Structures are given as structure tokens and as C-alpha cells.
């Protein structure tokens, strides 16, 4: 009788621990996906900003050269 | 004489997603609380 | 006697697993909070940068128009 | 004649937080090591 | 007369790492599936 | 005989749960490292962008002053 109680409690605990492990795996997967998406977003932002700052640099040097020619 | 229009690269499309794992945290805490119902009392 | 040993070891293991599950839940909550805060930070950065680049674009087109009028 | 001062939007306030879950990782590893003390030796 | 060259600060070195915990997620799911082989059948 | 079965199943389950806890700890450590690295990356980006926008602001005010002097 005590053996059946031990077995039932152990099976219940193992089922709950399986649920907890599935939840942990799902949460870690979602966190990995979101962290990687934000990493790609930051990298795309840095690349686009490098392009934009290069464009601004070119335009500003051109404007400075025009001003030098004028004055 | 003329001057061109300086069009800068658009970055508005860059977006950062948000994570929603509150269901999993709630399930973990619920299981941590429910494991008291699995303790053996001989 | 062996039943009492099994029950004691099982209760100890269940307590330790409860501690581990609470720690995992706390860690996942902190990670979620920080990931979401950094996501909001990146989004705010993109919005403010869009505004700033629009301002720079307007100012640069104005300067180019002034230079065109001068030369 | 005059020219205005171009004030650009300030972005210095944008800050990214850091996470500190080393306590939880240490507790998880400690429990994984201590579960050896819960093995049944009949 | 002359005009200097405006060199803007380089930001290309700023990079965001990526995480690879698929091994750990796979191990967690594998253990959650294998714990069925540890159920007691008296 | 049933006691030995209970003990063997419990030891197997505890070993698997130890493996799962080690995996969870490793995953949380990697996630913490990557989240903190991306946070430092975003902070470095904001600082460098503040510097760059200050430089652009200074250059643009200088160009506007030159244009005011010319016209």
C-alpha cells in the first residue's frame, strides 16, 4: 500500500517535472529567437547608419568644398 | 545651375521584437507550488 | 525502513527541484524584462534617429538650395 | 540677415539595461550537484 | 583659403552577438521525453 | 523487488533531472552573456552616435554661419 503511494506520488512528480521542462524549453526557445532577432536588428541598424553617415560625410565635404570655392 | 536632393537611407523598418514567456514562467511557478501535492506522507 | 528512506530521499529531491524551478522562473523573468527593455530602447533609438536624420536631411537640402542660389 | 541654430534631438537618455541572473545559475548548478545526495542507496 | 575634411566617428565595429542554445533546448526536450522511461510500473 | 525498481527508477529520474538542470544553467548563462553583450553594444552605439551627432551639429552650425556671412 505504501509502495503504491510512493509510485503514484513519483509518477505525479515526474509528470509535473516533464511539464516544467517543456515550459523551460519553450521559454528558452522564445528568448533565443527574440535575442537573435534583436541582434540582427542592431546589426542592420549599424550597417544602415554606417551608410547614412558616409552619405552625410560626402555631402558635408562637398558643401565645405563649395564654400571654399565661394570664399 | 542646379543642386540634387540628398535622400538619406531609411531606417524606420528596423524593429526589435518583444518576448512573451509569461505563460511559461507562470507554469513553472505553478508546478513549483503543485509539487507539494506530490510529497510522500507514509 | 527502506520505505522511509525512499520517502525521505524523494521529499528531499522534490524540495531541491522546487528550488530549481523557482530559480529558473526568476531567471526567465529577469531575462524577459531585460530583453524587453533593450527592445524598447532599440525602438526608441530608431525613432529618434529617424527624426534626427529627417532634420539633417531638411537642413542639408536647405543648405544646398542656398548654395545653388549663391552659385 | 540671420541664421538659426540647428538643435538636433538628444538621444543620450537611451540606455540598455543589463541582466544579473548569476545567483539563479549558481543555484541551479548547486542543486544539480546536491541532487547526488538524494540518490537512494537501499 | 582652405577647408578641413570632416571625419566622422566610425561605428562599424559595433556588433551584436548571437546566442546558440539549441543544444540545451534539444537536451531539455529529450529529457522531458525520456522521463517517461523512468515512470514506475509496479 | 518493487523497492529496487522504485529506487532504480528514482535514480534514473534524478540523473535525467540533473542533466536537465545543467542544460538549463548553461542556456541561462549563454543567454545572459549574449544579452549583456548586446546591451553594451547598444550603449556603445548610443555614445558614438551622440558624439557623431554633436560633430554634425557643430559642422552644420559652422556652415550656416559661413552662409550667413556670405549672404
Numbering used by the authors:
A (entry chain B), C (entry chain A), F (entry chain C): 918 to 988
B (entry chain D), D (entry chain F), E (entry chain E): 1159 to 1200
Provide text from the study:
Severe acute respiratory syndrome coronavirus 2 (SARS-CoV-2) infection requires fusion of viral and host membranes, mediated by the viral spike glycoprotein (S). Following host receptor binding and proteolytic activation, trimeric S mediates virus entry by formation of the so-called HR1HR2 six-helix bundle that pulls together the host and virus membranes. HR2-based peptide inhibitors presumably promote bundle formation together with the heptad repeat 1 (HR1) region of S, precluding some or all of the intrinsic HR2 regions from binding to the HR1 regions and thus locking S into an extended, prehairpin fusion intermediate that precludes viral entry.
During structural characterization of HR1HR2 bundles by high-resolution cryo-electron microscopy (cryo-EM), we observed the formation of a well-folded N-terminal region (residues 1159–1179) of HR2 in an extended conformation, outside the original range used for previous peptide studies. The additional N-terminal residues of the HR2 fragment interact with the three HR1 α-helices. Moreover, the densities for residues 1164–1167 are also improved compared with the previous reconstruction. Residues V1164 and L1166 form hydrophobic interactions with the groove of the HR1 bundle. In addition, the backbone carbonyl oxygen and amide nitrogen atoms of residue G1167 form hydrogen bonds with the sidechain atoms of residue N969 of HR1. The N-terminal extension of HR2 interacts with HR1 in the postfusion HR1HR2 bundle in an extended conformation. In contrast, the Omicron variant has three mutations in the HR1 region—Q954H, N969K, and L981F—and all located at the interface between HR1 and the N-terminal extension of HR2, possibly explaining the somewhat weaker inhibition activity.
